[PDB]
Every structure is written in structure tokens, then in C-alpha cells.
Amino acid sequence: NNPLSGLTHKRRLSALGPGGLSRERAGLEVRDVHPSHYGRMCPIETPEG
Amino acid sequence: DSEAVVAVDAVSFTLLQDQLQSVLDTLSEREAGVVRLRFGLTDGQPRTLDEIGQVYGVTRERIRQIESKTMSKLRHPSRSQVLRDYL
Amino acid sequence: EVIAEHPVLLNRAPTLHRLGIQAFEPMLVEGKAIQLHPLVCEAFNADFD
Amino acid sequence: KLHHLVDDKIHARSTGPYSMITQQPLGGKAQFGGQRFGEMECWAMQAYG
Amino acid sequence: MLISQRPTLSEDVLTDNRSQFVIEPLEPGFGYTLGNSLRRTLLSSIPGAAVTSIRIDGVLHEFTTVPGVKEDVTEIILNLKSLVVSSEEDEPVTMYLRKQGPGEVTAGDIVPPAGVTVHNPGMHIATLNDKGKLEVELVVERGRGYVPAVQNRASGAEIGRIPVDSIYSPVLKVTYKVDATRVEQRTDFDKLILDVETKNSISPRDALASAGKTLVELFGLARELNVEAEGIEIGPS
DNA sequence: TGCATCCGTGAGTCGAGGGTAATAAACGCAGCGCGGTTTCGGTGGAAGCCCCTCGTTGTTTCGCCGCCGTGACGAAG
DNA sequence: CTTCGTCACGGCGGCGAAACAACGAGGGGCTTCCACCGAAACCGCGCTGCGTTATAATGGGAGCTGTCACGGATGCA
């Protein structure tokens, strides 16, 4: 619905799927912003659902 | 569920069936009974005009005459104006 | 005419306390948004975001 | 302007179609659907008596 | 253009002098257009007469109490402040009141000459006592709106004088509130509700008629820029 | 007896919301019931034939328009 | 100012038209066929079922397995 939702939908680093961990199996700790995200993953742009 | 009652049809089906009495009764009662079995609405079997001869003691051709006597005078819009809303 | 003093119900998921639902007498409003009296929102805990 | 229009998020229903197994309504704005009244609504619903 | 749907006006009494006025259906948003202006006008356009200055015997600096009467001076002051009077001259008129002997001195005891009329004789004033004997002198005039107390520059000449405010407008208070009458079928029409409340000297409705007069005059003073200008009109009656 | 050790549970009211895969096959016989086909049939819809339901006259009578006169307010000098 | 012309007012009355009742000729009630429905039949054959196949062939592919806690039911020692 906008050029951003076109772009930033890519460059998406998902945690779920085959080989990924399901939400209920996805516990509290994994949701955290690891120090190893600095520069790698955006530490702020995450879904709020 | 394809078998769902629209529930407007059902109320409107009752209204159809009641306008039917209100229109038939405003017509002659011999004719009202004639059609009630000719189309066999109140029963399961629509009838032919030679079954009617026993129940109404008249020649089948006379019910041929009465069928038009029903329809044409019905075909006066007065009956049609109040029934054309039913479609 | 038909809405002349005919109460209706207003709900919001979640409803936690009893007052999560409220009965109101509705008035016709132009537009597609439900205008909620600005006092019950506390019970509804509903903000207009 | 955000893509959350009140032209998009209204659903009304007096009576639409019904579920297959149960005679219950269906869910969705696309289908005429019908609104869900949950247990957690039943709670306050009785709490009102 | 025409209003295209004639609005009405209904006056509804609540007391002998206090009344509401419902106007409907105004064109969208027009409730505020005229309501705030109208309340301002009623507060600041209806002529009337009120007390302006005072002086009483005995007091020169004792702005607390005076003998004979028991209560303070401010009590009598505020009593007289809320006095209804009507005058027919813009010169300063003078009235006296002089009651000897203990009792209850009222507004019926004041002796207003012709040309100055009082409409609340039976308004109590003073709890005169101890065979109290008084002489209160009231400098009065007529005007409009609310004029605060103008102090006496000639302090020596009128040194027992007392400056005081004046509610020249005979109305006490008016409020207005708008409504949403037939917004859906008739495109956001609104109904104004007015509530006017005035002194006993005049009525609620009459000052309203005078306000209408003053404002239509004031806007004729402007419409005389293009006499044949196509604005909006109303229609029949 | 403990005692570890699996294990059977629940873990948000709710809106956004239709579908994705694979292996060796052939001959032949029987029932078969659906669909080509093959009879007349009387009851069907015409064709021609007789007793009773619907239109002429014989008044009746209110109605009404021509007539008849009245009177006045008008019409012209 | 005088005197004539007109236009309703009200009735008069004699025509006049429309309603109401003695009833007789277009419907209601008769046969008299056969192109037909409709039956009854006489079929064959796609469609389903079911039988057989003759060198030897003789042990699953796959699945990715984890939370979080907790009571408790269950194999040991």
C-alpha cells in the first residue's frame, strides 16, 4: 500500500517457520533484543502484535 | 448451510398463502374450491376437470369455462396490483 | 421512528469488569463511526486511537 | 493518513447466512457474517443479572 | 439567496422576568454566529439606570461601620448596588433617604423625584437601631453595559463621596447553547436555545427586541457598502 | 519406600482470512439398465348436433331547462 | 339630473329520460372420429464388476526430534 511496505517488507528477518520456533514454543527470552543485534537487526522496528 | 431458511421467504410465504385466501375468498367460493384442488394446493394432488365433476357435479368443459372466468377477472389489475408485489 | 427509545448494547473486547458492556439508548448519527459519550470510556477502558 | 478507514472496518448484520454444522452465523466482513459474543462477555452478562 | 427553510422563534417563560428562546432550524454552524454576539449585546446594549456614587452623613474615613445602623458599610453598599432604577435624563440625578428611629430601612423609604423611578420599594436595606438617624445620598444616572466605580478625583470637594459600579444594562445574565436539530435529513441544521434573565424593572423579551433592533441597525451600517449585494434571505411570514 | 522421570495438561477477548502431492496393466466375460428401437390406443382435441338464459316495450316520474314574469341595479343621454 | 337596458331571481311547467317488469334465441348439453400419448415392449451395449497374468525378484524411509510450569502418575531400587 506504499513504497515502504514494498521495501521494508523485504529485509525482514523472521523468527518463525520450518526450522523456526512457533509462538507458543517461542518463550520470553528469545523475544529480547540481544546485544548481538547492534548493526545487524533493527532493534526498534518489530511488530507490536 | 445451503438448507437455511431465508426467514423472509417463510414470513413472506405465509403472506403469500394468506393473500391467497384473501383473494380467493373475495372471488367466488365455487371457484376458490375449484382451484384449491385443481392446483391441489391445500392437498397434494392437483386435479383434472373430470375429477371436479364428481365433487362439483358439472361437466369438465364447464370447469374449462370457469378456469378462464377465474383468470380473466383476476386479470383485472385490481387483483394483480395487490399481488404483483409478491415477486 | 423505529429507534425511538430502543436500547442497544455496546461491547469492547476484552470485557474484564462487569461494566465492560453497557446498554445505551442510541441516536441516529451521520457517518460510519460510533460516537461514544466521553465519560463511559474509563469503564470501557477504550481510547480513540 | 493511515490505512485503517472507518469505510473499511464496519460490519452490520440483522441476519445473514449461517454456519454449516451449527445454525450459528459466520465470521467476517466479506460474508455478511455475524458478531461473536464470547464467554468472557457472558461473564459480565450474568454479572449484570 | 434565501434561507430555503424559514426558521421560527419561541419564547418560553420560566419566571415573571426570566425566559428562554428557542430558534430553529438555523443553517449549519449559525448558532454560534449569532449567539455569542447576542449575549454580548444583551449585556452591553440595553440602556438603563443604576447608582453611580454614594455619600452618607457621619463617615469621612470610617469605611467599616456607621452608628444608628448596625451592619457594616459594605453591606449597605452592596444592597444599594443591586438597585433597580429608571432615569429620563443623562445629567446626574440625586436622591436622598433619611429614616429616623430603629427599624428596618428599605428601598421603599427612598424619595426618588419624578424622572427617577424605583421598582423595588420593598427591598430591605438597613437594620437601623438605637434610635438611629441616617442620611444617605445617591448620585444616579443612566447608561448601558457595565461601568465600574469611577473614583472621585475631587477628593476634597466630595470627600464623603463613595464611587461605585453601575449595571446600566437592565439584563442580569444570558446564556446560549446550540443543538443538532435535523442534521441528517436537513444537512446539519442547528437550533439555538437562549436563556435571558433580567431585572424586574423591564421584561426578558423586550430587551431582546431592542437587542435585535440594535444589531440589525449595526449590520445595516455595514450592508450599506453594496446595497444590491446577493446575500441570504429568509422568505415569508 | 523413595525417587527420579515422563507426562498431560493450559497458556487472550478478539479483526486481517478460500486449495498444497503419486505409480509397470491390460484382455475378457456377465449383468446390465439406459437408451435406441417398434406396436395401437382410446382419449384426447376438433367437428357437427339439440334445450334453456338474457334483451323489446310500456310505463313512471323526478328532474330540469325553456318560459315566464319580477325587480332592480344598472346604462345611456 | 333624467330616463332606458340588463341581468339575475324565483317560480312554472311541460318535456324527457331512466328505472323497472310481461319474457325467447346464443350458451350448456349431446355424439363421432382417428393424429396421437402413452403404454408396453423389444431390443443392444457403456458401464461395473470380476477373473487372470508364470525368472527371480524376500524386511518401512522418515523424522527431527526442544517452551513453561506443574502435579501427578509411573518404572526403579
Side-chain angles (χ1 to χ4, degrees), chain A residues 1-10 12-28 30-49, chain B residues 1-2 4-46 48-80 82-87, chain C, chain D residues 1-30 32-49, chain E residues 1-99 101-129 131-134 136-152 154-157 159-160 162-183 185-223 225-237:
Chain A
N1 51 358
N2 63 346
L4 202 47
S5 64
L7 173 68
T8 188
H9 177 51
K10 281 82 72 177
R12 188 181 292 282
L13 301 176
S14 197
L16 288 81
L21 71 171
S22 70
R23 285 178 28 199
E24 185 168 320
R25 271 68 159 161
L28 166 64
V30 293
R31 309 183 151 270
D32 297 332
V33 179
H34 211 270
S36 45
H37 290 262
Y38 187 49
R40 285 90 179 142
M41 185 180 288
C42 188
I44 306 307
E45 180 197 353
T46 188
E48 45 184 80
Chain B
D1 190 359
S2 68
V5 287
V6 164
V8 189
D9 52 354
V11 287
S12 69
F13 199 67
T14 52
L15 269 294
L16 280 149
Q17 288 147 306
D18 293 28
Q19 186 97 56
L20 185 55
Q21 297 326 110
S22 70
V23 165
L24 282 175
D25 295 331
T26 56
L27 292 171
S28 181
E29 302 324 285
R30 309 198 57 206
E31 304 170 284
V34 171
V35 181
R36 267 152 210 167
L37 317 167
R38 188 260 169 289
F39 270 101
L41 177 53
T42 47
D43 47 299
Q45 300 83 241
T48 299
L49 278 56
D50 188 74
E51 294 86 297
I52 315 181
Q54 64 180 20
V55 182
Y56 286 155
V58 65
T59 176
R60 51 190 190 119
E61 193 52 64
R62 209 78 162 86
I63 304 103
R64 287 176 173 85
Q65 186 177 9
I66 206 169
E67 276 323 298
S68 182
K69 211 58 170 171
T70 299
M71 296 291 168
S72 172
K73 293 187 167 212
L74 278 155
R75 276 172 194 119
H76 293 114
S78 80
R79 283 70 172 273
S80 311
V82 297
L83 205 48
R84 186 35 74 167
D85 54 351
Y86 279 97
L87 178 151
Chain C
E1 308 180 43
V2 309
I3 315 299
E5 274 84 43
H6 193 274
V8 292
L9 315 173
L10 272 67
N11 172 21
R12 177 182 161 260
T15 76
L16 290 96
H17 55 93
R18 167 197 174 199
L19 264 51
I21 301 171
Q22 270 82 0
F24 296 90
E25 65 91 23
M27 293 180 183
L28 282 297
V29 159
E30 261 291 0
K32 295 193 187 66
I34 318 169
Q35 316 210 358
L36 180 69
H37 188 276
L39 260 176
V40 292
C41 296
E42 208 169 0
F44 280 126
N45 200 55
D47 68 327
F48 303 96
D49 73 340
Chain D
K1 161 172 166 177
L2 213 68
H3 178 258
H4 291 346
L5 299 177
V6 66
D7 205 0
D8 306 331
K9 291 199 189 334
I10 71 161
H11 203 44
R13 176 180 187 265
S14 64
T15 304
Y18 292 110
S19 178
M20 182 66 190
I21 312 160
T22 73
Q23 275 275 325
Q24 299 178 183
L26 304 94
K29 193 182 159 268
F32 305 148
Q35 286 291 322
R36 165 146 196 76
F37 187 93
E39 168 75 12
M40 182 179 72
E41 290 73 2
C42 307
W43 297 345
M45 188 67 203
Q46 303 104 21
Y48 275 106
Chain E
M1 150 73 88
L2 275 285
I3 204 78
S4 77
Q5 195 56 59
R6 164 158 184 76
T8 72
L9 166 59
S10 166
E11 176 194 324
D12 301 355
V13 56
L14 294 191
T15 58
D16 56 77
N17 47 1
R18 186 272 304 279
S19 182
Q20 59 185 46
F21 296 81
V22 295
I23 291 148
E24 181 183 319
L26 270 164
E27 299 309 294
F30 268 88
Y32 306 95
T33 60
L34 59 92
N36 208 359
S37 69
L38 183 53
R39 65 160 304 274
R40 190 63 54 68
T41 301
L42 272 297
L43 262 65
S44 294
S45 166
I46 313 300
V51 189
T52 60
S53 181
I54 297 98
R55 61 180 56 86
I56 77 174
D57 45 340
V59 61
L60 190 49
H61 289 350
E62 53 179 3
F63 286 82
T64 81
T65 184
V66 292
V69 68
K70 303 290 98 175
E71 76 272 13
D72 57 289
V73 296
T74 296
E75 178 55 70
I76 303 148
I77 285 160
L78 63 89
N79 287 124
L80 270 60
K81 195 185 286 181
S82 61
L83 269 176
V84 305
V85 288
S86 284
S87 179
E88 284 84 20
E89 53 264 14
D90 290 1
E91 71 94 21
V93 301
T94 183
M95 283 73 74
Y96 277 23
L97 54 88
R98 277 87 48 82
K99 200 151 186 182
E104 64 98 19
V105 191
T106 76
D109 293 329
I110 196 179
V111 292
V116 289
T117 69
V118 162
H119 316 96
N120 58 0
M123 161 185 178
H124 160 82
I125 301 178
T127 50
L128 207 59
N129 293 115
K131 181 68 174 66
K133 169 58 160 69
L134 55 87
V136 180
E137 310 175 359
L138 293 81
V139 190
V140 172
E141 63 185 342
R142 54 173 296 167
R144 288 155 64 248
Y146 184 36
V147 173
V150 61
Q151 281 78 61
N152 169 30
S155 303
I159 189 61
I162 297 89
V164 62
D165 296 358
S166 69
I167 51 173
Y168 288 144
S169 191
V171 308
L172 281 73
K173 186 157 52 176
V174 63
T175 58
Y176 83 113
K177 68 177 185 183
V178 307
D179 269 314
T181 57
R182 198 70 269 166
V183 299
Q185 181 266 334
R186 265 172 286 151
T187 73
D188 295 332
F189 288 176
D190 51 357
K191 159 209 70 187
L192 185 49
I193 304 166
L194 289 144
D195 182 75
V196 308
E197 190 276 331
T198 77
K199 300 161 183 167
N200 54 4
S201 300
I202 67 153
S203 76
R205 53 178 180 178
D206 304 328
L208 187 148
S210 291
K213 184 196 75 170
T214 46
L215 290 166
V216 67
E217 167 192 294
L218 180 54
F219 273 80
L221 274 158
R223 177 191 28 82
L225 274 194
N226 189 262
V227 189
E228 283 76 8
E230 183 202 304
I232 313 297
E233 276 75 72
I234 304 169
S237 297

